[PDB]
Amino acid sequence: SLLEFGKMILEETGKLAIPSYSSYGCYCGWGGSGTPKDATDRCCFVHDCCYGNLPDCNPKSDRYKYKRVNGAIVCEKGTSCENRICECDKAAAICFRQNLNTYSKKYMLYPDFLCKGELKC
Template sequence: LCCCSRVSVLFSVTFRKYFYTIRGLLELAGVVKCRTGRSAVAYIMYGCYCGLGGQGWPRDKADWCCHKHDCCYGKAEDLGCQTKTDKYQWTCENKMSNCCMNYTSHNDRCDKMLCRCDREAARCLRRAPFIPKYSVWPDFMCGYSNQIKCCLSHTHI
């Protein structure tokens, strides 16, 4: 998660902006780092829903953020978006991530949706406490029940 394909640094009079164009999930990692100040690596095995997959009941608020993000990506995939490979452009300024693109083609709509999914997840993670005991939570501790339905994720954050 630490390699970027391209990083351009733009300077303005009052702000320093970082403009990223990276692939797929690496963009999520960048947005999480921008908003939370924490490396996305810290969330790779966090709880039951952060990282790849997800099962059982989310452990805490941060895990619910990841569940909600999984649901958001699920909606994007239902619309034909490639959540693991689509890329989008964004900026990070003062711990705020902003999507920057035109929304005319199908890919642009997907880019917009994925950027919003990632931005909302990072905003949610910023507000949620990071509890170290969940940072390497084993899957078997999540139970083997089906994944929690997406409509439930909005009520627990």
């Protein structure tokens, strides 16, 4: 759920999910169109696509458990949905940490009219 995802983000990047990753670019948060603006936005695109592969799961509200084996994120056994949601979130958190160096505040609160086109998952 968003509760675990937000915590994973904070632990990984030192940034709070809201508002650093909730209105960034075209895909981070409310958002599903246009060309991703930068690496971080591409992380969100992939994350959206990952959730899209789970039509009969509820990733926003279904809670999963994860532990940290030293630095590594390890998803603990749960239902099939919880397992797959956790893997989507883990990937996004790592993607965010890998691209922190290019995170740009100019993409915060990005207006919707600047998100143009389509990218197919």
